[PDB]
Amino acid sequence: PMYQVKPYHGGGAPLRVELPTCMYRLPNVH
Amino acid sequence: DPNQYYKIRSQAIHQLKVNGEDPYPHKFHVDISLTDFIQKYSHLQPGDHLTDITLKVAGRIHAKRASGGKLIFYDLRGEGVKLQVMANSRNYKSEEEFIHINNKLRRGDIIGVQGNPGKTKKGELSIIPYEITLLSPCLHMLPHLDKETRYRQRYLDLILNDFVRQKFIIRSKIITYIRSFLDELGFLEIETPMMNIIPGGAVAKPFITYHNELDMNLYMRIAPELYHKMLVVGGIDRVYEIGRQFRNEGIDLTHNPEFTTCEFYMAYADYHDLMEITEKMVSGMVKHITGSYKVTYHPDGPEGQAYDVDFTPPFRRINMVEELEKALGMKLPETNLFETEETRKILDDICVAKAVECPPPRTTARLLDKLVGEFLEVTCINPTFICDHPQIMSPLAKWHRSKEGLTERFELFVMKKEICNAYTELNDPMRQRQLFEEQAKAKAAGDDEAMFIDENFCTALEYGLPPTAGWGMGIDRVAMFLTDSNNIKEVLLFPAMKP
Amino acid sequence: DPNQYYKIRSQAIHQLKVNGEDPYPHKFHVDISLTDFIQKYSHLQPGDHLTDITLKVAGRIHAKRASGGKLIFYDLRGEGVKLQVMANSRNYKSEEEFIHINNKLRRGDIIGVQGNPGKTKKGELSIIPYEITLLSPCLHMLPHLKDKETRYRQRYLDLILNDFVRQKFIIRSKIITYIRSFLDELGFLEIETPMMNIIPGGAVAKPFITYHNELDMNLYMRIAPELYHKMLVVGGIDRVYEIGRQFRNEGIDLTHNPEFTTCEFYMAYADYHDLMEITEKMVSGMVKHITGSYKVTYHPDGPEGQAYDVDFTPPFRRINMVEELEKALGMKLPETNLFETEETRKILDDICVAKAVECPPPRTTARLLDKLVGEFLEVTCINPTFICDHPQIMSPLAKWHRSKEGLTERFELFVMKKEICNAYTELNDPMRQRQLFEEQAKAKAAGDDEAMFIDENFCTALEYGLPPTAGWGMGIDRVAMFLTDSNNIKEVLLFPAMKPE
Ligand SMILES: CP(=O)(O)OC[C@H]1O[C@@H](n2cnc3c(N)ncnc32)[C@H](O)[C@@H]1O
Ligand SMILES: N[C@@H](CCCC[NH3+])C(=O)O
Ligand SMILES: N[C@@H](CCCC[NH3+])C(=O)O
Ligand SMILES: [Mg+2]
Ligand SMILES: [Mg+2]
């Protein structure tokens, strides 16, 4: 097996991109 | 009558614009995908109607069915799924508007639907509209249920044929899997020129093009190989590129003028290392995408027999010269004699005796290629490494460390077709320049398949290319085997077509 | 001297082959990367020597220094890091082999080293070799401590000598990988569409032409994938993207190369308002992820000029093109629409003359407007700024604005006075699109060699119904320039196109 080389992403954690978001809604009490 | 349909619908849509009814509205606020709608509400009982939930969906009408005067069903499709729209006038915003929209809509139209989840008494999940909006009319009669039309109007193929989308999802999954595999091994994804002063790295007839401000011809690349090796001289030990290559040649079941390959180069690896990495990558890719190592394939299409192709590692290996001697039933010359005219004549006689055709020029490399295609490649059903090609057919591959006249090369064949080519890289600049000079002498003599000499590449090797192994894979051919396609046009969104 | 160096070293390496010493061995088994070696053994104290640990590493010799007759130091480099080789005669396999290997090696050679971790009394982490193997000699004098043209014509020398160069190409790869993760996570399908077309489309550019021999027809290298992507949305693939090469047959300058990389994506049921929000989230998130913050230093005129901090903190500023241009000019503009009209064109021509804004022929309404926007609006766009609502005459594939007559639902994102994104609600009415194509065909015959060809195949696809859709394109090379503090596009292309020497 070939020698280990760390990924260029750093190797810490998988990339988790920030995504667009939507403010939640609460139901009409009436 | 399709022509009459288009004239009539076009006039009707033009009338809607005149009347200010906006048949191409700018924005419709889709709330939920059809897929999520089906998942969220499949649990409903027949007859249910969730009057408190309202949602907006959109898609293309594939069917329209009236049921009495106050009820109409639309088969709404998108994302590879379908949802019934059950439009009854009792739930619509108003009876006058209900009549008006239903008279407007036709099969093929894109629509937005605002309404409630429900289930019919017969148990079909439905959305019950308060309002339907025409988003984009279809001016033509949508077809229902040759191959040229599917490839010349791929959007019609996608609308009609659910399997087509799935093939291109699989193709994308293959490429994304390969990037993940190599990124995890510490490779850097790079981009190298697609326009070159000297095409190289493969045997191919190139496209030529003129750059005006520079007043000089450029060639579209046939492979990125020589640039990647210069980057390894530059100290980037592991590089890869998934990108387009170009060949100015013929079109058939396994060739298109533009096609996609992955090449990678790995410092301090040899071709033994690359066989193990190939086995791990290819078997892991098949299992991840299909769920098992065994894939069904119809080499002759659905009209013929199918075979399970077994990708369980290790793959079979055969050595080209030894296996050819078995297939021919005769001893071939010693491999250190493969550069002689005596060996060329022996191969020429064998091709004549076996009725293996080889058009001129009848060079040793071309006669060997024809013999290998006839006698070895046809036995490679399951993934099979063909190894240790003669140097005379591998001008960029390093000489074999123990077999004189051979190289450290392999090709991976599946179902009789090449999917990978790889070798320990030739990194001795004197020997590489000598092989290029032989190529250039053959090119000047009339052999169009010979490579151009690349002086800048040979100079780069003079600065020291570490021992290295490189690899290329034809992505389209891999997508063919993983989609049960025997025609490359099935895995190209817009294949090149005779006009 | 460098010519003499090469002849002498080539002759020495040839003699190694004759003597059976194999100067290009097939395989050396590296145990550990230089980066991992440093991380594992940086903890050693000065004077440490781990005689029980034997490792194999490899790299390129960047310096060779003899210290008396029994000690030689090699500066071994790889992966952007360095490791001293402290070769002591007493720790080598034998004194005779020690003399032999040291007389063989030169600066620039690729070597493999088998030895123990150690640290000198001066505190320098080292490997102490039992055996060194020549893996690939450098036949030339390797340069030291360059000139811009040589750096681009021999990029491998630039990568060997200048650590900052590798870092720029790592950043470029991170940009692309970030964009794919963002679009994949939003449900987009990554697609590949033809790079050779009978009719180039989707942008304003002069194409490359090439000939296909079997089909006996000319083909054009693509200038944009845009029309293919919209046909796939007609086909029901709601979200598609492609990061790939485009081609323009023009001149070379600080922001222009004949081939370059873009990302385009198309999103059914979005409009350009949705795409501004997505652009702000993608670009700000990418900048913070790659650089660690929203603020980036940039030298628009290179290191000899002033630098500015560019602030990517969202939301980005928005300006409307025509109304902001009218404020910068101090005067109202004539209204434009789909048709070129000489009265309006003359007024804009007069404005450019009075303001000394150059416009080479043809001085069309769209080109004169573009030059005015470049002089008065783009120059104010230091932080990322959306310029919005372009006139229809500038935007033949953009949908008409739903509330502003004669404008379109378009934006461009400018950073440091340069365009990085172009996007719009897509025109999806086939009759209107055919009409705009007919206007482009007229302007081509009148002298505009960048004007679009009519594409009847694409108009036919629109007749089957393209859903309301918004699409977007980003110049990847320009983004890479801003995130690597490069003001020359050649800094972010591994092998930039170069005039023949
Ligand atoms: C069969 P053979 O004579 O050995 O040629 C090997 C070459 O075929 C290339 N190639 C790969 N896939 C291709 C496809 N679909 N259409 C056309 N060419 C394709 C591949 O880069 C390699 O350089
Ligand atoms: N450039 C080769 C693939 C890589 C071979 C190993 N350096 C080809 O076109 O087949
Ligand atoms: N094709 C455009 C980018 C996409 C515009 C939105 N459809 C360009 O070259 O600038
Ligand atoms: Mg082959
Ligand atoms: Mg622009």
Question: Tokens for C154?
Answer: 């021999």
**How many Å apart are CA B187 and CA C495, to the nearest integer?**
19
**Among candidate residues B492, B258, B200, B195, the one with its CA nearest the CA of residue C246:** B195
**How many Å apart are CA C243 and CA B37, to the nearest integer?**
31
Q: If you measure CA to CA, which chain C residue comes closest to B169? A: C189
Nearest to B194 among C231, C249, C259 (CB): C259
Q: Which residues have a Cβ under 8 Å from the Cβ of C362 and sit 6 or more positions away? A: C443, C446, C447, C448
- With H, G, I as helix, E, B as strand and everything else as coil, classify residue C32: coil
Task: Answer yes or no: is the C-beta of C203 below 6 A from any ligand 3 atom.
Answer: yes
Q: Does C39 touch chain A (CB under 8 A)?
A: no
- Paired strand residues for B61: B76
Nearest ligand to the CA atom of B389: 4
Cα of B260 from ligand 1 centre, angstroms? 10
End-to-end CA distance of chain B: 26
SS (H, E, C) chain B: CHHHHHHHHHHHHHHHHHCCCCCCCCCCCCCCCHHHHHHHHCCCCCCCECCCCCEEEEEEEEEEEECCCCEEEEEEEECCEEEEEEEECCCCCCHHHHHHHHHHCCCCCEEEEEEEEEECCCCCEEEEEEEEEEEECCCCCCCCCCHHHHHHCHHHHHHHCHHHHHHHHHHHHHHHHHHHHHHHCCCEECCCCCEECCCCCCCCCCCEEEECCCCEEEEECCCCHHHHHHHHHCCCCEEEEEEEEECCCCCECCECCEEEEEEEEEECCCHHHHHHHHHHHHHHHHHHHHCCCEEEECCCCCCCCCEEEECCCCCEEEEHHHHHHHHHCCCCCCHHHCCCHHHHHHHHHHHHHCCCCCCCCCCHHHHHHHHHHHHCHHHCCCCEEEECCEHHHCCCECECCCCCCEECEEEEEECCEEEEEEEEECCCHHHHHHHHHHHHHHHHHCCCCCCCCCHHHHHHHHCCCCCEEEEEEEHHHHHHHHCCCCCHHHHCCCCCCCC
**How many Å apart are CA B81 and CA B41, to the nearest integer?**
14
- Paired strand residues for C369: none
Place of tokens 């890479």: C480
The minimum CA-CA distance between C496 and chain A, rounded to whole Å, is 23
In order of B124, B278, C10, the CA distances from B436 in angstroms are 69, 29, 18
**Among candidate residues B42, B32, B124, B116, the one with its CA nearest the CA of residue B78:** B32
Place of tokens 């020589």: B226
In order of B369, B411, B492, C77, C268, the CA distances from C224 in angstroms are 39, 35, 18, 41, 19
| C274 secondary structure, DSSP code | H
Question: Tokens for C248?
Answer: 């323009």
- Paired strand residues for C37: none
Domains in chain C, please, with CATH? 2-145 (2.40.50.140), 146-498 (3.30.930.10)
Question: Tokens for C487?
Answer: 């003001």
- For chain C, helix, strand, coil in percent to 5 are 35, 25, 40
**How many Å apart are CA C173 and CA C11, to the nearest integer?**
41
Nearest ligand to the CA atom of B247: 1
Question: Tokens for B213?
Answer: 């401000």
- Please report, as a single letter, which amino acid is at residue C273: H
Interface test with C, best of B109, B459, B493, B498 (most C CBs within 10 A): B493
Q: Which residues of C247-271 are buried (b: 16+ CB within 10 A; e: fewer)?
A: bbbbebeeeebbbbbbbbbbbbbbb
Question: Tokens for B338?
Answer: 């493969």
Smallest CA separation from ligand 1 atom 2, residue: B418
Place of tokens 């090379």: C477
Residue pair C470/C423 in contact by the 8 Å Cβ criterion: yes
| Interchain CB distance below 8 Å, C178 and A17 | yes
CB atoms within 10 A of CB C175: 26
Residue pair B276/B223 in contact by the 8 Å Cβ criterion: no
Resolution of this model in Å is 1.9
Say how far residue C281 (Cα) sits from the centre of its chain.
Answer: 21
**How many Å apart are CA C150 and CA B358, to the nearest integer?**
46
In angstroms, what is the C-alpha Rg of chain A?
21
Q: Candidates B238, B245, B421, B476: which one to mutate for ligand 2, based on the most atoms within 8 Å of Cβ? A: B421
| Interchain CB distance below 8 Å, C285 and A15 | no
Q: Candidates B246, B249, B259: which one to mutate for ligand 1, based on the most atoms within 8 Å of Cβ? A: B259
Place of tokens 């009148």: C446
Greatest Cα pair distance in chain C:
92
Task: Answer yes or no: is the C-beta of B200 below 6 A from any ligand 1 atom.
Answer: no
Place of tokens 């063989």: C104
Residue pair C181/A15 in contact by the 8 Å Cβ criterion: yes
Q: Which residues of C322-355 are buried (b: 16+ CB within 10 A; e: fewer)?
A: bebbeebeeeebeebebebeeebbeebbebbeee
Structure-determination technique: X-ray
Does the bond joining C315 to the residue before it have cis omega, within 30 degrees of 0?
yes
- Paired strand residues for B412: B385, B420
Question: Tokens for C142?
Answer: 């390797």
In order of B356, C107, C398, C400, the CA distances from C403 in angstroms are 72, 69, 14, 9
Helix (H) or strand (E) holding C476: helix C476-483
Q: Which atom of ligand 2 is nearest to the CA of B224?
A: 1
CB atoms within 10 A of CB A8: 18
Exposure of C483 in the CB half-sphere (CA atoms within 13 A)? 30
Residue pair B427/B269 in contact by the 8 Å Cβ criterion: no
Angular region, B73: left φ>0, alpha ψ -120 to 50, beta rest: beta
Residue pair B253/B228 in contact by the 8 Å Cβ criterion: no
* Chain B residues within 8 A of C6 when measuring between CB atoms: 462
**How many Å apart are CA B262 and CA B478, to the nearest integer?**
11
**How many Å apart are CA B136 and CA C425, to the nearest integer?**
14
Parallel, antiparallel, or unpaired: how do β-strands B238-246 and B258-267 relate? antiparallel
- State the Cα angle at C173 between C380 and C501, rounded to 5°: 80
| Interchain CB distance below 8 Å, A7 and B183 | yes
Place of tokens 């609502």: C389
End-to-end CA distance of chain C: 22
Signed CA dihedral, C485, C487, C492, C495: sign only: negative
- With H, G, I as helix, E, B as strand and everything else as coil, classify residue C16: helix
- Paired strand residues for B127: B85, B117
Question: Tokens for B280?
Answer: 């791990």
Does the bond joining C362 to the residue before it have cis omega, within 30 degrees of 0?
yes
Question: Tokens for C45?
Answer: 């104290």
Angular region, C270: left φ>0, alpha ψ -120 to 50, beta rest: beta
